[PDB]
Enzyme design. Structure first.
Site, mmCIF file in Angstrom:
data_model
loop_
_atom_site.group_PDB
_atom_site.id
_atom_site.type_symbol
_atom_site.label_atom_id
_atom_site.label_comp_id
_atom_site.label_asym_id
_atom_site.label_seq_id
_atom_site.Cartn_x
_atom_site.Cartn_y
_atom_site.Cartn_z
ATOM 1 N N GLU A 35 0.824 -1.190 0.000
ATOM 2 C CA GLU A 35 0.000 0.000 0.000
ATOM 3 C C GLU A 35 0.861 1.242 0.000
ATOM 4 O OE1 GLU A 35 -3.024 0.370 -0.284
ATOM 5 O OE2 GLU A 35 -3.874 -1.566 0.200
ATOM 6 N N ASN A 46 -8.076 9.145 -4.724
ATOM 7 C CA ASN A 46 -8.932 8.117 -5.388
ATOM 8 C C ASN A 46 -9.799 8.867 -6.399
ATOM 9 O OD1 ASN A 46 -9.139 6.917 -2.107
ATOM 10 N ND2 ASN A 46 -7.923 5.969 -3.775
ATOM 11 N N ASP A 48 -12.857 9.282 -6.736
ATOM 12 C CA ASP A 48 -14.072 9.707 -6.076
ATOM 13 C C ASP A 48 -13.734 10.968 -5.250
ATOM 14 O OD1 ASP A 48 -13.201 8.582 -3.626
ATOM 15 O OD2 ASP A 48 -14.611 7.178 -3.364
ATOM 16 N N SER A 50 -11.872 11.000 -2.579
ATOM 17 C CA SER A 50 -11.408 10.727 -1.186
ATOM 18 C C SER A 50 -9.868 10.662 -1.379
ATOM 19 C CB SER A 50 -11.929 9.435 -0.609
ATOM 20 O OG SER A 50 -11.679 8.318 -1.482
ATOM 21 N N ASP A 52 -6.285 8.383 0.299
ATOM 22 C CA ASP A 52 -5.789 7.308 1.160
ATOM 23 C C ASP A 52 -4.420 7.784 1.807
ATOM 24 O OD1 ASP A 52 -7.742 5.526 0.195
ATOM 25 O OD2 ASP A 52 -6.369 4.621 -1.142
ATOM 26 N N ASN A 59 -8.569 5.270 4.071
ATOM 27 C CA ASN A 59 -9.281 6.243 3.210
ATOM 28 C C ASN A 59 -10.219 7.210 3.942
ATOM 29 O OD1 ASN A 59 -11.925 6.353 1.288
ATOM 30 N ND2 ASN A 59 -10.047 6.541 0.125
#
Ligand SMILES: [Br-]
Ligand SMILES: [Br-]
Ligand SMILES: [Br-]
Ligand SMILES: [Br-]
Ligand SMILES: [Br-]
Ligand SMILES: [Br-]
Ligand code: NA
EC number: 3.2.1.17
Length: 129
Positions: A35, A46, A48, A50, A52, A59
């Site tokens: 990650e 992301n 959308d 958001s 991370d 997130n």
């Protein structure tokens, strides 16, 4: 901070993640690895809106507040910046909520696709623990 692999295993175990919800330490180290490459300051946006954050890429849609994800929750009750600290406590506490939520470590799509079912103990092999 960029942790080394055994440093991070030891940090994870110290904070109670080894076998947390049944997930042996090599699974948490593998998920970290893909990650964030073990870097506490990793961030990624992301599609959308958001974002991370941190070593386990947690997130802002559900877990942390970053002030700019409309409609989201902050079920960890922390600023997403907390997740980018050299001290992993806030990443770990929020990860134990996430892995308890129903889908276990499948909430981390990189652990389902890159770690699940593999010899995750290779990520802690050799380390003093
Ligand atoms: Br490595
Ligand atoms: Br927000
Ligand atoms: Br906040
Ligand atoms: Br730490
Ligand atoms: Br599970
Ligand atoms: Br393991
Ligand atoms: Na949020």
């Amino acid at each position: 901070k960029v942790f080394g692999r055994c440093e991070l295993a030891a940090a994870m175990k110290r904070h109670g993640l080894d076998n947390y919800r049944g997930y042996s330490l090599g699974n948490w180290v593998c998920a970290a690895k893909f990650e964030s490459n073990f870097n506490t300051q990793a961030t990624n946006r992301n599609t959308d809106g958001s974002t991370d954050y941190g070593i386990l890429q947690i997130n802002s849609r559900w877990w942390c507040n970053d002030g700019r994800t409309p409609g989201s929750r902050n079920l960890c009750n922390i600023p997403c910046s907390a997740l980018l600290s050299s001290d992993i406590t806030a990443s770990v506490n929020c990860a134990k909520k996430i892995v308890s939520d129903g889908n276990g470590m499948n909430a981390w799509v990189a652990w389902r696709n890159r770690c699940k079912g593999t010899d995750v103990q290779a990520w802690i092999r050799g380390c003093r623990l």
